[PDB]
Amino acid sequence: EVQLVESGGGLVKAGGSLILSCGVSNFRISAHTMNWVRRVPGGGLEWVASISTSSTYRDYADAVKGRFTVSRDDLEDFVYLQMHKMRVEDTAIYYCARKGSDRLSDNDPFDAWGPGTVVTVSPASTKGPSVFPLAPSGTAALGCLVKDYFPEPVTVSWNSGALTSGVHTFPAVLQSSGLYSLSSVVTVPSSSLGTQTYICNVNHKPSNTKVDKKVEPK
Amino acid sequence: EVQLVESGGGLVKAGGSLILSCGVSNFRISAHTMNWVRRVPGGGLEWVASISTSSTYRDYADAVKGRFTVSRDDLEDFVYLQMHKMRVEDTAIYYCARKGSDRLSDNDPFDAWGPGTVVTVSPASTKGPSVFPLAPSGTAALGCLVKDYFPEPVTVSWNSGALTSGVHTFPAVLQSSGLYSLSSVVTVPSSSLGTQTYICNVNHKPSNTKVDKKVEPK
Amino acid sequence: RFNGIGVTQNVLYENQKLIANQFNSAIGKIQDSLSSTASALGKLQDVVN
Amino acid sequence: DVVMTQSPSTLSASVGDTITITCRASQSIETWLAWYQQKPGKAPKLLIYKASTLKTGVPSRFSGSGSGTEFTLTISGLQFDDFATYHCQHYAGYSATFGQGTRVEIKRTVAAPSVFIFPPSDEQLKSGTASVVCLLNNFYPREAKVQWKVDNALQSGNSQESVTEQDSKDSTYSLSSTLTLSKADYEKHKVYACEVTHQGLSSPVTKSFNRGE
Amino acid sequence: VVMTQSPSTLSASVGDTITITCRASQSIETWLAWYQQKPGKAPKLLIYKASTLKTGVPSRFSGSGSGTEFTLTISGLQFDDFATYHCQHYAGYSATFGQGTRVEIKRTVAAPSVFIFPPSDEQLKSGTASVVCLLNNFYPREAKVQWKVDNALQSGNSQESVTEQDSKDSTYSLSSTLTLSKADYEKHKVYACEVTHQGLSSPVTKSFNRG
Ligand SMILES: *[C@@H]1O[C@H](CO)[C@@H](O[C@@H]2O[C@H](CO)[C@@H](O[C@@H]3O[C@H](CO[C@H]4O[C@H](CO[C@H]5O[C@H](CO)[C@@H](O)[C@H](O)[C@@H]5O[C@H]5O[C@H](CO)[C@@H](O)[C@H](O)[C@@H]5O)[C@@H](O)[C@H](O[C@@H]5O[C@H](CO)[C@@H](O)[C@H](O)[C@@H]5O)[C@@H]4O)[C@@H](O)[C@H](O[C@@H]4O[C@H](CO)[C@@H](O)[C@H](O)[C@@H]4O)[C@@H]3O)[C@H](O)[C@H]2NC(C)=O)[C@H](O)[C@H]1NC(C)=O
């Protein structure tokens, strides 16, 4: 028996990027042309890429040609597949199989395969923010809490740029959900809380989302 | 300017695997020793891997030695870094750095750097499930419902193996949270809903989190 | 040796990597032959038989 | 360039049946076909490494043929082991292409789905998520369609389906569909229904419930 | 090879001449370099071969030393020079770095003004509670925030973020967010934030009672 061991596969976002790799055991890849194959949710096998012995010639299936790059390491026995700007239909199990035979030739089938690794390309390429008020309970503090937006960045202004003094817009934090969240605050005179209107202008160019939120006492 | 662009960042779990890569423009990589570097939580740098010209030598810091693997593919100008068995201290920005000078020598600093990509290793190496009853409305259907676990499997049995006829446990689904969900069901005579107490004895075997739930009419 | 077969010796240097690679590849086929095909040794096994 | 025209897309049979399948190349190849089995979610296994040319270690029940344009696979009395997909491949030096695989399956008469709808448990709902489940408990053949309607509004994009493979005692398929809604959105509407069509049904079947009743 | 760098934080005024020292555990000859790093940016080379200034690096940066003692001198700090800095031993096919030094603008000690904010009703109705503790306009940068719920020390459920030095008053500000589901937040009443800082003779606590 001989073995191949795919790694790196998981959840992805459309127009995002991932890299797969395949290790091996009981054999050396330095003799073999190495191939990537996938099984789509529709159940059919698609060939994806190959790279020759001696790393000479690299070839691709026409759905991934130009978008993907196949790579190899003949010494530690690893193969790689960069997947730049994935499509929703790049969702598949991705297998790494060796072109091979007991005696090798200038044309053979795939005589050993690894168990395959799942890749899912979720269709949400950009997510637009939610915006929530940070309500002011001398000097008072108020703000806006931008949340659940992807990718960066978000820009925030206050009163269309007329209110700049005392404003702090914080660096975003990356949540364990894979989505970003930032807060923008401003300190102002407590006396102005009854008359002055405070509006934070949240712009998210990647989703083409604009939100104007008025922040007022509860 | 010299152009470098990393790809393949984002979230990972302790004990998990990832692959980084970097591609370049305005130079060919083949004349350069190439490196990976990271910025650990104290704002300090660490060097992570270096691969020489023609892939002759590969050296690593002791923290990542034997866990990681660098590779390069000069004919398309790409560099790769596999990260098997990631651990929480690998949480950092990562960068692809060129060893170089205005005039290259046998030993040089790192001259051109890509903008970097973030990698986060979350400590959720075995996230235990949430387990919930599916309550019976001549034949009745009941069940149990598993949400929010990683990795697979979550395993289920009915009354510690006393019930097996009409039992089904469904294939897991990968949620947009990046965590698994499934359900287990059984069909039984409606007359038995009053006398027989159905229970599901479960385990998330990776975390060895053993759970039970009685299923009875609401 | 290329001058010995009457081939002008620059035909080696202008092709030296191609010739080195064809020698190395042809030595590779010897292992595939001798590993796979026990009947290649037929004369020596005939003498021993 | 070659495309493979494999036929049928699904073959129905049973234990001990001799079965034949056929791959037809859209333009001629020099007998460069091979054939694979694939069990659900597994790696394929190579059976026949050139047309009519069985791989060593493969069970002797397998066979096939090739004519440069038309080709076959044949199995000499199916085992319970054989009820998997089968794929033809045309393999060239640095590329390949495959047939849309012939799914081999255990035959029976047509059977319509028993449909059941489940509301979210109160215990799920208090956490803020509502998962509404529709169960097509047993039917044959595999192909069925389920649509969700909320307040008679056809839903789109908020459900996930999975099918269990053939049951060990009756060989029926079964489907469940999960409609996912936050607690907020779920309490916005009353009726939650699923509508089913299938080979055995003369009209669509709808199961519904009213939230809170 | 191992290296040490001192001081870990250097506070100075604009125009000052400052020195940052690197010490190697064993002789490294003149095989050492220096790097400037801004927040959120990859490091930029300043000096190599101990003293060799990189082409285009301003003349105010200089380096000296050999064997085990090395110094980076900035002669006349400009506002651009207030950054992270790192000594770096380099060898034919490898390197190593010291711990770094952070250079900041010096000002008097200023204690944080502390504020705690409970979760908004809107967010709370969605099922998540994010309290936010704010430490406003403090100096120096080191501050510690501990969250306590019903006098219970929290751990692993908060994240922090800190601003860069304010351009007008040279202070820092810090926000800490403790995140809890609605299911976990309603379990406990009081939510406190215990702050320690060089400007506080004893820790300061701001709290609220749920509801
Ligand atoms: C004078 O004559 C000589 C020959 O006598 C000429 O030299 C030859 O020139 C050809 C044309 O330029 C080159 O052909 C091209 O090569 C590339 C790459 O080929 C790689 O694979 C070769 C085969 O290796 C296989 O097969 C053998 C058995 O035959 C096995 O032992 C081996 O292990 C390996 O097996 C694996 O791969 C198979 C598929 O390849 C699988 O079926 C197996 O199961 C297994 O996985 C190999 O020998 C080559 O060796 C290298 O060659 C490099 C130079 O090309 C050289 O740099 C290096 O050092 C090695 O020596 C390669 O590794 C193919 O991809 C080309 O395919 C065509 O591409 C076209 C598009 O570009 C396309 O339209 C067309 O359809 C084809 O797909 C093509 O075959 C030869 O490689 C080259 N040979 C040598 C020894 O140099 C010379 O050029 C000529 N000069 C003049 C002026 O006339």
CSV table of N, CA and C in Angstrom, one decimal, chain B residues 119-182:
chain,number,residue,atom,x,y,z
B,119,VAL,N,-2.9,35.6,10.2
B,119,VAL,CA,-3.4,34.2,10.6
B,119,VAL,C,-3.7,34.2,12.0
B,120,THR,N,-4.9,33.6,12.4
B,120,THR,CA,-5.4,33.5,13.8
B,120,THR,C,-5.6,32.0,14.1
B,121,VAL,N,-5.0,31.5,15.1
B,121,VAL,CA,-5.2,30.2,15.6
B,121,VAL,C,-6.1,30.2,16.9
B,122,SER,N,-7.4,30.0,16.7
B,122,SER,CA,-8.3,30.0,17.8
B,122,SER,C,-8.2,28.7,18.6
B,123,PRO,N,-8.3,28.7,19.9
B,123,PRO,CA,-8.0,27.5,20.8
B,123,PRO,C,-9.1,26.4,20.8
B,124,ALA,N,-10.2,26.6,20.0
B,124,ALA,CA,-11.3,25.7,19.9
B,124,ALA,C,-11.0,24.3,19.1
B,125,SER,N,-9.9,23.7,19.5
B,125,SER,CA,-9.4,22.4,18.9
B,125,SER,C,-10.4,21.3,18.9
B,126,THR,N,-11.3,21.2,19.9
B,126,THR,CA,-12.4,20.3,20.0
B,126,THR,C,-13.6,20.9,20.7
B,127,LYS,N,-14.4,21.7,19.9
B,127,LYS,CA,-15.6,22.4,20.3
B,127,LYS,C,-16.8,21.4,20.5
B,128,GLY,N,-17.3,21.2,21.7
B,128,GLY,CA,-18.3,20.3,22.1
B,128,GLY,C,-19.7,20.8,21.6
B,129,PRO,N,-20.6,19.8,21.2
B,129,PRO,CA,-21.9,20.1,20.6
B,129,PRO,C,-22.9,20.7,21.6
B,130,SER,N,-24.0,21.2,21.0
B,130,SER,CA,-25.3,21.5,21.7
B,130,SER,C,-26.3,20.5,21.2
B,131,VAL,N,-27.0,19.7,22.1
B,131,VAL,CA,-27.8,18.6,21.8
B,131,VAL,C,-29.3,18.8,22.4
B,132,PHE,N,-30.3,18.6,21.5
B,132,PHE,CA,-31.6,19.1,21.7
B,132,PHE,C,-32.7,18.1,21.2
B,133,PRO,N,-33.8,17.9,22.0
B,133,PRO,CA,-34.8,16.9,21.6
B,133,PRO,C,-35.7,17.3,20.4
B,134,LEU,N,-36.0,16.3,19.5
B,134,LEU,CA,-37.1,16.4,18.5
B,134,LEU,C,-38.3,15.6,19.0
B,135,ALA,N,-39.3,16.2,19.4
B,135,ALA,CA,-40.4,15.6,20.2
B,135,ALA,C,-41.5,15.0,19.3
B,136,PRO,N,-42.0,13.9,19.7
B,136,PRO,CA,-43.0,13.2,18.9
B,136,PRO,C,-44.3,14.1,18.9
B,137,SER,N,-44.9,14.3,17.7
B,137,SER,CA,-46.1,15.2,17.5
B,137,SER,C,-47.2,14.8,18.6
B,138,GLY,N,-50.7,5.7,13.5
B,138,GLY,CA,-50.3,4.6,14.2
B,138,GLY,C,-48.8,4.6,14.5
B,139,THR,N,-48.0,5.3,13.6
B,139,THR,CA,-46.6,5.4,13.7
B,139,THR,C,-46.2,6.9,14.1
B,140,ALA,N,-45.3,7.0,15.0
B,140,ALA,CA,-44.8,8.3,15.4
B,140,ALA,C,-43.3,8.4,15.2
B,141,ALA,N,-42.8,9.6,14.9
B,141,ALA,CA,-41.4,9.9,14.7
B,141,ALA,C,-40.9,10.8,15.9
B,142,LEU,N,-39.7,10.5,16.5
B,142,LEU,CA,-39.1,11.4,17.5
B,142,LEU,C,-37.7,11.6,17.1
B,143,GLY,N,-36.8,12.1,17.9
B,143,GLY,CA,-35.4,12.2,17.6
B,143,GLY,C,-34.6,13.1,18.5
B,144,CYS,N,-33.3,13.4,18.2
B,144,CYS,CA,-32.4,14.3,19.0
B,144,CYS,C,-31.8,15.2,17.9
B,145,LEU,N,-31.3,16.4,18.2
B,145,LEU,CA,-30.7,17.4,17.2
B,145,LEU,C,-29.4,17.9,17.7
B,146,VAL,N,-28.3,17.7,17.0
B,146,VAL,CA,-26.9,18.2,17.4
B,146,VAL,C,-26.6,19.5,16.6
B,147,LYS,N,-26.1,20.6,17.2
B,147,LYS,CA,-25.6,21.8,16.6
B,147,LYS,C,-24.2,22.2,17.1
B,148,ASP,N,-23.5,22.9,16.3
B,148,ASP,CA,-22.3,23.7,16.7
B,148,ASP,C,-21.2,22.9,17.3
B,149,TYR,N,-20.6,22.0,16.6
B,149,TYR,CA,-19.4,21.2,17.0
B,149,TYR,C,-18.3,21.2,15.9
B,150,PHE,N,-17.1,20.9,16.4
B,150,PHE,CA,-15.9,20.6,15.5
B,150,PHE,C,-14.9,19.8,16.4
B,151,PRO,N,-14.1,18.9,15.8
B,151,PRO,CA,-14.3,18.3,14.5
B,151,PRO,C,-15.3,17.2,14.5
B,152,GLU,N,-15.5,16.5,13.4
B,152,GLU,CA,-16.4,15.2,13.5
B,152,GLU,C,-15.7,14.0,14.1
B,153,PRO,N,-16.4,13.0,14.5
B,153,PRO,CA,-17.9,12.8,14.5
B,153,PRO,C,-18.5,13.2,15.9
B,154,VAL,N,-19.8,13.5,15.8
B,154,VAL,CA,-20.8,13.3,16.9
B,154,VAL,C,-21.5,12.0,16.6
B,155,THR,N,-21.5,11.1,17.6
B,155,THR,CA,-22.1,9.8,17.6
B,155,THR,C,-23.3,9.7,18.4
B,156,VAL,N,-24.3,8.9,18.0
B,156,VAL,CA,-25.6,8.8,18.7
B,156,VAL,C,-26.1,7.4,18.7
B,157,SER,N,-26.8,7.0,19.8
B,157,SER,CA,-27.5,5.7,20.0
B,157,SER,C,-28.8,5.9,20.8
B,158,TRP,N,-29.8,5.0,20.6
B,158,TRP,CA,-31.1,5.1,21.2
B,158,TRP,C,-31.2,4.1,22.4
B,159,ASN,N,-31.4,4.6,23.6
B,159,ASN,CA,-31.5,3.8,24.8
B,159,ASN,C,-30.3,2.9,25.1
B,160,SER,N,-29.1,3.4,24.8
B,160,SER,CA,-27.8,2.6,24.9
B,160,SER,C,-27.8,1.4,24.1
B,161,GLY,N,-28.4,1.4,22.9
B,161,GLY,CA,-28.5,0.2,22.0
B,161,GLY,C,-29.7,-0.7,22.1
B,162,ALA,N,-30.6,-0.5,23.1
B,162,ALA,CA,-31.8,-1.2,23.2
B,162,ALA,C,-32.8,-1.0,22.1
B,163,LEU,N,-32.7,0.1,21.3
B,163,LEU,CA,-33.6,0.5,20.2
B,163,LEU,C,-32.7,0.6,18.9
B,164,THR,N,-33.0,-0.1,17.8
B,164,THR,CA,-32.3,-0.1,16.5
B,164,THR,C,-33.2,-0.2,15.3
B,165,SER,N,-34.3,-0.8,15.3
B,165,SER,CA,-35.3,-0.8,14.2
B,165,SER,C,-35.8,0.6,14.0
B,166,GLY,N,-35.8,1.0,12.7
B,166,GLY,CA,-36.3,2.4,12.3
B,166,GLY,C,-35.4,3.5,12.7
B,167,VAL,N,-34.2,3.3,13.2
B,167,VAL,CA,-33.3,4.4,13.6
B,167,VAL,C,-32.6,4.9,12.3
B,168,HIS,N,-32.5,6.2,12.2
B,168,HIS,CA,-31.7,6.9,11.2
B,168,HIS,C,-30.8,8.1,11.8
B,169,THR,N,-29.5,8.1,11.6
B,169,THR,CA,-28.7,9.3,11.9
B,169,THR,C,-28.2,9.9,10.6
B,170,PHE,N,-28.5,11.2,10.4
B,170,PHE,CA,-28.2,11.9,9.1
B,170,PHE,C,-26.7,12.3,9.0
B,171,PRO,N,-26.2,12.3,7.8
B,171,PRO,CA,-24.9,13.0,7.5
B,171,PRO,C,-24.9,14.5,8.0
B,172,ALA,N,-23.7,14.9,8.5
B,172,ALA,CA,-23.6,16.2,9.0
B,172,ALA,C,-23.6,17.3,7.9
B,173,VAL,N,-24.0,18.5,8.2
B,173,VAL,CA,-24.0,19.7,7.4
B,173,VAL,C,-23.1,20.7,7.9
B,174,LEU,N,-22.3,21.3,7.1
B,174,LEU,CA,-21.4,22.4,7.5
B,174,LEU,C,-22.2,23.8,7.4
B,175,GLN,N,-22.4,24.4,8.6
B,175,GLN,CA,-23.1,25.6,8.7
B,175,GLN,C,-22.2,26.8,8.3
B,176,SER,N,-22.8,28.0,8.0
B,176,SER,CA,-22.1,29.2,7.8
B,176,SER,C,-21.2,29.7,8.9
B,177,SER,N,-21.4,29.2,10.1
B,177,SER,CA,-20.5,29.4,11.3
B,177,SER,C,-19.2,28.6,11.2
B,178,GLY,N,-19.0,27.7,10.2
B,178,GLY,CA,-17.9,26.8,10.0
B,178,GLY,C,-17.9,25.6,11.0
B,179,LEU,N,-19.0,25.4,11.7
B,179,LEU,CA,-19.3,24.3,12.6
B,179,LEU,C,-20.3,23.3,12.0
B,180,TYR,N,-20.3,22.1,12.4
B,180,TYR,CA,-21.2,21.0,12.0
B,180,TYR,C,-22.5,21.0,12.7
B,181,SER,N,-23.6,20.5,12.1
B,181,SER,CA,-24.8,20.1,12.7
B,181,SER,C,-25.3,18.8,12.1
B,182,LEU,N,-26.1,18.0,12.9
B,182,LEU,CA,-26.8,16.8,12.4
B,182,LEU,C,-28.1,16.5,13.1
